[PDB]
Design a protein around this ligand. Structure first.
Ligand SMILES: *[C@@H]1O[C@H](CO)[C@@H](O[C@@H]2O[C@H](CO)[C@@H](O)[C@H](O)[C@H]2NC(C)=O)[C@H](O)[C@H]1NC(C)=O
Ligand SMILES: *[C@@H]1O[C@H](CO)[C@@H](O[C@@H]2O[C@H](CO)[C@@H](O)[C@H](O)[C@H]2NC(C)=O)[C@H](O)[C@H]1NC(C)=O
Ligand SMILES: *[C@@H]1O[C@H](CO)[C@@H](O[C@@H]2O[C@H](CO)[C@@H](O)[C@H](O)[C@H]2NC(C)=O)[C@H](O)[C@H]1NC(C)=O
Ligand SMILES: *[C@@H]1O[C@H](CO)[C@@H](O[C@@H]2O[C@H](CO)[C@@H](O)[C@H](O)[C@H]2NC(C)=O)[C@H](O)[C@H]1NC(C)=O
Ligand SMILES: *[C@@H]1O[C@H](CO)[C@@H](O[C@@H]2O[C@H](CO)[C@@H](O)[C@H](O)[C@H]2NC(C)=O)[C@H](O)[C@H]1NC(C)=O
Ligand SMILES: *[C@@H]1O[C@H](CO)[C@@H](O[C@@H]2O[C@H](CO)[C@@H](O)[C@H](O)[C@H]2NC(C)=O)[C@H](O)[C@H]1NC(C)=O
Ligand SMILES: *[C@@H]1O[C@H](CO)[C@@H](O[C@@H]2O[C@H](CO)[C@@H](O)[C@H](O)[C@H]2NC(C)=O)[C@H](O)[C@H]1NC(C)=O
Ligand SMILES: *[C@@H]1O[C@H](CO)[C@@H](O[C@@H]2O[C@H](CO)[C@@H](O)[C@H](O)[C@H]2NC(C)=O)[C@H](O)[C@H]1NC(C)=O
Ligand SMILES: *[C@@H]1O[C@H](CO)[C@@H](O[C@@H]2O[C@H](CO)[C@@H](O)[C@H](O)[C@H]2NC(C)=O)[C@H](O)[C@H]1NC(C)=O
Ligand SMILES: *[C@@H]1O[C@H](CO)[C@@H](O[C@@H]2O[C@H](CO)[C@@H](O)[C@H](O)[C@H]2NC(C)=O)[C@H](O)[C@H]1NC(C)=O
Ligand SMILES: *[C@@H]1O[C@H](CO)[C@@H](O)[C@H](O)[C@H]1NC(C)=O
Ligand SMILES: *[C@@H]1O[C@H](CO)[C@@H](O)[C@H](O)[C@H]1NC(C)=O
Ligand SMILES: *[C@@H]1O[C@H](CO)[C@@H](O)[C@H](O)[C@H]1NC(C)=O
Ligand SMILES: *[C@@H]1O[C@H](CO)[C@@H](O)[C@H](O)[C@H]1NC(C)=O
Ligand SMILES: *[C@@H]1O[C@H](CO)[C@@H](O)[C@H](O)[C@H]1NC(C)=O
Lengths: 181, 463, 463, 463
């Protein structure tokens, strides 16, 4: 993707953003009194329909905000915020979350590594069930043998903990982090 | 309740009027009661770094949109390249600045620094007490990174309302700062230890390593206060200096203009991101703000036309956003250049320039971290209680016209002091205090018609 | 009638070539006939302040438009907020500048100031003769405020054509300046009374209060002209200075670049307002430029569509206008910062920098008000009639190699003067005139191989 | 093949820690092995000048679009006026800059300049060896003018791919530079001949005309290196200086940031023109990118509507282009003002300001022509091998408390040299080397409690 955006076969070294992992849908949750068993399912990213209102998102059990019997709670940008279920419980809706991705490209050695941003390695796995683009196998050529590595900026793949101190990597990851070639 | 507003005229404070005189002598205005004070300024050095997943911003995985968007795929490629170049420039302005704030050498920092000077700027061996006040008074949202994304996620409080979690819906990413706050603190502690002093000639090579109090006395003698006064008032000087710094604990309000500028640097960053978020719900005459809904409700011959209307307005918003970021990035780079010059003038040296600090000559200044920039404090000297005295352009021996003298960094005044039997006396240019005229306070000059003729007693030359 | 144009090459004025020499002595180029002259510059400090009545510019109270416009009411809210913030920044840049031009003390200003210097800058005790020439040569429309609107009204001449009264049709408002012309005049009279002088060290506390002519002689001795010359030529110096100032009465033409810049500051403000006015008649493919007419001629199902097209283009013009104002406001603020630095260097002190001011060292400069800014005048010193002379790096006693001297602020030259029996003579660094070598003109230095060996007569040391 | 990337922490280089001491003496850090070095920068001064034949850009003289375009003819009139004003400002910033780089007088330039210094900057009596390296490393297309247009034409190679020939299709014109490269070379040769010197006070009037090597020694004594050292090390100094300059032959790579900036100034100009070229093929939903083809395929009622859509998008591209040029032109003008100040500070004089130039005090700097700007080189002084020594604030006579001295541009250190019997010794502030204390290295000062009291031997005063 990076090569196509620069229309070239030799992109300059740097850290570059690439498209993010989306969400991954989960089985539907529907409420519309007037079929089972989908009345509730907390929850990950399950598509939903609520009395003809629809969208995709995660539900969570929460407190009780006003006003009840208007059924749909909204924010100032008209995003749905939460819902009153006919089981008498308020639930909140956070829509869904995504994993930002960027890559580390070293043009001199023609090698690369990646960064998942602030997502943390507890949600990172060797294969993905999201998704973004068809493969990441070139990373896997080395990373089939390693666990993900947590860093202060974020979880990364194929970084290795060398604990070296260097003045300038020409590939800083922000903070004090540095991506040596 | 309160009454009517009152119309009023803006006051004009008139300057003290010193009478012009002709002849061989002149009236001189000189202060008798100096007081320390502080002024402050905020100089922004960076823009928060942002990137945008342009494919995700325009649509959210809908396949009809993905097919349609490919006709415009080159717009997103231009958008990503432009933002990437802006972010690289922000990183370079930071590294360039920090390369010059660093000193080759410094004193270690210990408690009790400065003797009688209080110096609350010392690190809590950390950041600093003043930096903590700035970060706590500022209303900026708590940073991401750690834990970050898991405060977006359902494993957290129902009350989060952060725009930072909205980044993972909208495809925004705020990049982490380049330096790490701990290294930033280390760079400004190095500046604190370079003080005392930048005198003794240049100061770019050798390091004097003298007590802070000693460097202050040299700076006070560098503004024309005589050394005799400085030795007499040392405790008084320390107390006035501490009172000027004591006011800093009450200075962090929005009525303080420098603080207000810090607050609006934060507000500008938040607003730039909120604009993109509000546009996600903005139809462009399209039937709905949601692509999945507009697909669900339409036959495909109409559906595609509606989506294209929606896509074009979304791309237009991103283009305007990039243009705004490019302008702001440039102004920050220029502002960072100004900060670099003040660190290499106002922090690392006493300044003789006026117009560049507080308006009271210059004496030592300090710098601390603030959001997106540097925050400076300038100690300065403020004159008060001016008196007018008789003064002469110079003195000459009446018996020998070629022996003439003129004061160095001070003035010759008619004596008004009971300790001095001599008809004339020397005083400092920043503070009134008579002293006998001696060779240390004078230089020989060519004779001039306005110099006074002394019929008898002059000590330099005695003859 | 005139003939053909002539092709020509641009001249390159070659520098005077001074021969390079080896050995213990060198060729020196020094001026023999200085002449005064002036330069001028205009530094803008503000943008004219403008606001725009939203619920007005787009439509003129027609009710169909009011109903339609409500869908877009948030655009006008953003427009008003942006203009309001721009105007607040213009007010702060003005107050910040004036806070530094003020002096704590000054001489009273009286007629006959400066002795033999003419000084036509004195207030007509008012503005000043020079400020009046600037305001009269400028073609700017007469301001409003008072009376203002009653010159829009039928109670006035049929020949008024002011864009200023067109403001009350278009909904524009030009805000009044923040300071009033009288207080501005008072601030620059205070600067005039602070001169004479900024010397004697400091000048950030005490005020010398000496005649203007005396401060000029100190400035001339500060550029390396010896005092002996200055006392001999005092009337000559006053005449040359007055001739340089006399040229200011003919300098206000568009061939003077600084004057031309004043004129275009005015032109830019007028053009920004005229652009909005011309757009009132600009259809956007709408049937008519008038909303009342387009309502009168159409059935309501069509009428609303036509008005919407017209509204969208009008909002787009206002958005472009605001963006233009924000850019101009920023450049003016930066320009005002430059003006602040020149007042605190070039006006309040002699400058050693070169660079700034006219290209002739520096001697006193003056500042006056001009539309939207400050107009500076810089007196400068221009060398002429350069001659080449033999000079030495220093002198020493041939009988005692440890006694070596070198000139202070001048050079040792082989004597060419019949008055002086001594083999060597001292001259100023800005003006050629021999004098005997005496201890006042020298300093002791470590010995060096290039110093001349004097076999007999040197007065400092005599031995 | 290469393995995995390595995570690493960014190093923080700690400053040398000099111990703080109390009491009457203090620890002093001083360098023992200086080395020369060079730093470089590029300051852009201009934007390439461009004009556009707006009628030709929108359409190619087809008569249907000519008739349609007349409705929009006022847009092109505004476009041409805006570009014309931008080009006039570029010409004025150039003439203003060159008026200050010129010197009224200079040395002739001959081979062997600088004695033992290598001086590869000398003109090949032309441009210069360094300017040729810079222009050859740059990838910019060969210039037009001569022969120009006949390299567009079929009377030339089939391999030309110049955007410059595409100017004659698109209606672009790149205007020639204002100065002519030969005159530009003459202006910087005049600066090279003004070196030697800038010292001896003023330098805004008289011209010293001394050897380059002599002016270097004065600059080295101006940073606190004692004259005794300078005479001993003259050949060593020349060799270190030449090594620093010799590295310039390898400095022209993209890893050199200053060079990289030159390369991107060229890239920005090329990209601005290429954007307009790509838009010639961009349909706006029009049936074809070619007006002649869209005419050929359509009945006139449809034909005119299609062409109008195409015309409006083409005008919009030109409007965006003009806005971009106006912004860039302004930033270049401000950048040119910065260049003007460096020529009048960093080139024409030694600078005491630190922070500006390379970070090693300042010694002579040079400037050469670069594409669209000036390229500066700054020689600087870098300390190394710092040692810590005992030092005193001053000295006094124990038998007579009023006799007190303090060092000038140096420090009093406890002697560690076998050559000197005296208990104390004087050293330079930029370089460690002991010397006996003599009156040339001291000044009399008022007594202070921290001064050491000498029980026996002090030479200044002997008594
Ligand atoms: C010298 O100036 C100082 C100003 O810092 C004076 O201290 C203030 O004097 C005023 C006079 O009414 C009081 O209202 C304040 O309370 C004083 N203290 C402060 C902290 O502002 C001082 O009195 C002056 N005179 C002398 C002899 O020191
Ligand atoms: C000056 O030093 C003193 C101690 O010499 C300190 O003042 C106290 O500091 C403690 C610790 O934070 C506080 O709990 C007290 O309230 C402070 N006393 C006050 C404010 O009167 C502190 O280090 C310095 N204080 C100032 C005002 O400069
Ligand atoms: C001190 O004595 C000297 C004696 O030389 C005075 O200098 C003379 O002043 C008169 C006043 O008009 C001048 O005309 C003479 O030319 C001066 N003499 C020389 C040699 O230049 C000086 O004025 C006296 N000081 C005062 C205050 O009267
Ligand atoms: C000193 O310089 C002045 C210029 O400031 C010269 O006097 C002018 O000389 C020109 C020569 O062509 C005449 O045209 C002018 O009429 C002169 N007078 C002016 C401008 O007032 C001359 O070079 C010198 N004058 C001396 C030595 O008396
Ligand atoms: C020198 O000053 C005199 C008066 O002090 C000026 O003479 C008149 O000045 C007024 C106001 O400036 C003008 O309206 C008159 O036209 C002047 N008369 C003449 C005969 O000049 C004189 O202009 C000043 N000259 C210079 C060169 O500054
Ligand atoms: C040195 O002194 C001599 C005589 O005092 C000067 O010679 C004069 O030069 C001018 C220049 O054209 C002639 O008009 C005179 O006729 C010369 N006078 C005599 C008596 O010959 C000479 O200019 C002085 N300066 C230098 C640098 O040589
Ligand atoms: C003036 O006399 C001294 C001698 O006292 C000359 O000093 C020379 O200094 C250099 C140092 O670079 C030595 O190498 C020479 O040996 C010294 N010369 C002699 C004769 O001892 C100094 O050069 C003399 N000035 C001139 C212009 O010759
Ligand atoms: C004084 O400094 C110079 C410059 O660093 C030293 O010379 C070079 O030191 C480097 C260190 O890696 C060597 O690689 C070079 O071979 C040295 N020579 C040259 C010509 O570059 C010099 O050794 C230092 N002297 C002392 C006593 O420290
Ligand atoms: C240093 O000076 C030497 C001559 O003293 C020059 O180096 C030679 O320059 C010529 C001209 O390009 C070349 O043909 C030689 O190959 C160069 N010799 C070497 C050893 O480089 C030049 O002026 C300077 N060279 C350097 C490297 O600074
Ligand atoms: C060197 O002698 C000086 C005498 O001038 C000593 O200075 C005095 O030190 C005492 C110590 O408390 C002070 O009370 C006096 O006020 C000082 N004198 C002056 C004029 O201020 C100094 O202490 C001696 N230094 C050493 C190291 O013995
Ligand atoms: C959350 O839901 C549970 C049932 O799943 C309920 O018992 C509890 O009260 C709810 N929490 C609230 C209302 O805070
Ligand atoms: C990496 O190495 C450092 C070395 O001290 C260690 O402290 C750290 O725990 C290691 N692992 C991670 C995940 O940082
Ligand atoms: C000031 O002194 C001059 C010197 O001659 C004199 O002419 C003038 O009258 C004096 N001014 C007064 C006394 O106001
Ligand atoms: C300068 O002096 C040296 C000293 O020997 C000499 O060799 C050289 O030729 C001289 N230069 C000229 C141009 O005569
Ligand atoms: C430094 O001097 C002070 C002043 O008397 C003294 O109290 C202290 O003990 C000394 N030593 C240190 C290490 O501060």
């Amino acid at each position: 993707q990076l090569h196509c955006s620069y229309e070239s076969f030799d992109v300059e070294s740097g850290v570059y953003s690439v498209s993010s992992f989306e969400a991954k849908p989960s089985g539907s949750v529907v409420e519309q009194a007037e079929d089972t068993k989908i009345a509730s399912q907390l929850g990950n990213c399950v598509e939903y329909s609520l009395y003809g209102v629809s969208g995709r998102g995660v539900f969570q059990n929460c407190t009780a905000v006003g006003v009840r019997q208007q059924r749909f709670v909204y924010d100032a940008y008209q995003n749905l915020v939460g819902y009153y279920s006919d089981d008498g419980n308020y639930y909140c809706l956070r829509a869904c979350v995504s994993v930002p991705v960027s890559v580390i490209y070293d043009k001199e050695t023609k090698t690369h590594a990646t960064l998942f941003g602030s997502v943390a390695c507890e949600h990172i796995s060797s294969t993905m069930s999201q998704y973004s683009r068809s493969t990441r196998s070139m990373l896997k050529r080395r990373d089939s043998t390693y666990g993900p590595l947590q860093t202060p900026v974020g979880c990364v793949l194929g970084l290795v903990n060398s604990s070296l101190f260097v003045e300038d990597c020409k590939l800083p990851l922000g903070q004090s982090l540095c991506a040596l070639p | 309740v309160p009454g009517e507003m009152r119309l009023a005229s803006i006051a004009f404070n008139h300057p003290i009027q010193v009478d012009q005189l002709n002849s061989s002598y002149f009236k001189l205005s000189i202060p008798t009661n100096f007081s320390f004070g502080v002024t402050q300024e905020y100089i922004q050095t960076t823009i928060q770094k942002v990137t945008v997943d342009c494919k995700q911003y325009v649509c959210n995985g809908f396949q009809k949109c993905e097919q349609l968007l490919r006709e415009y795929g080159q717009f997103c490629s231009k958008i990503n390249q432009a933002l990437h170049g802006a972010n690289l420039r922000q990183d370079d302005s930071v590294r360039n600045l920090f390369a010059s704030v660093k000193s080759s050498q410094s004193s270690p920092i210990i408690p009790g620094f400065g003797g009688d000077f209080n110096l609350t700027l010392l690190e809590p061996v950390a950041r600093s007490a003043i930096e903590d006040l700035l970060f706590d008074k500022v209303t900026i949202a708590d940073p991401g990174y750690m834990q970050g994304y898991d405060d977006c996620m359902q494993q957290g409080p129902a009350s989060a309302r952060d725009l930072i979690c909205a980044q993972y819906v909208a495809g925004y990413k705020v990049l982490p700062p380049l330096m790490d706050v701990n290294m930033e603190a280390a760079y400004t502690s190095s500046l604190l230890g370079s003080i005392a002093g930048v005198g003794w000639t240049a100061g770019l090579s050798s390091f004097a390593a003298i007590p802070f109090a000693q460097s202050i006395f040299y700076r006070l003698n560098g503004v024309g206060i005589t050394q005799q006064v400085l030795s007499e008032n040392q405790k008084l000087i320390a107390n006035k200096f501490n009172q000027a710094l004591g006011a800093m604990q009450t200075g962090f309000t929005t009525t303080n203009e420098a603080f207000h500028k810090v607050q609006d640097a934060v507000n500008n960053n938040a607003q730039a991101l909120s604009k993109l978020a509000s546009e996600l719900s903005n139809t462009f005459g399209a039937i709905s703000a949601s692509i999945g809904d507009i697909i669900q409700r339409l036959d495909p011959p109409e559906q595609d036309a509606q989506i294209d209307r929606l896509i074009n307005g979304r791309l237009t918003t991103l283009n305007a956003f990039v243009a705004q970021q490019l302008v702001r990035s440039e102004s920050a780079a220029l502002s960072a250049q100004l900060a670099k010059d003040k660190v290499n003038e106002c922090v690392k040296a006493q300044s003789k320039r006026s117009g560049f600090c507080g308006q009271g000559t210059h004496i030592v200044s300090f710098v601390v971290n603030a959001p997106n920039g540097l925050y400076f404090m300038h100690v300065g000297y403020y004159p008060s209680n001016h008196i007018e005295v008789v003064s002469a352009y110079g003195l000459c021996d009446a018996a020998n016209p070629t022996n003439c003298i003129a004061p160095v960094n001070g003035y010759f005044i008619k004596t008004n002091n009971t300790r001095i039997v001599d008809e004339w006396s020397y005083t400092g240019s920043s503070f009134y205090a008579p002293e006998p005229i001696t060779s240390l306070n004078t230089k020989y000059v060519a004779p001039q018609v306005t110099y006074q003729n002394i019929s008898t007693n002059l000590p330099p030359p005695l003859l």
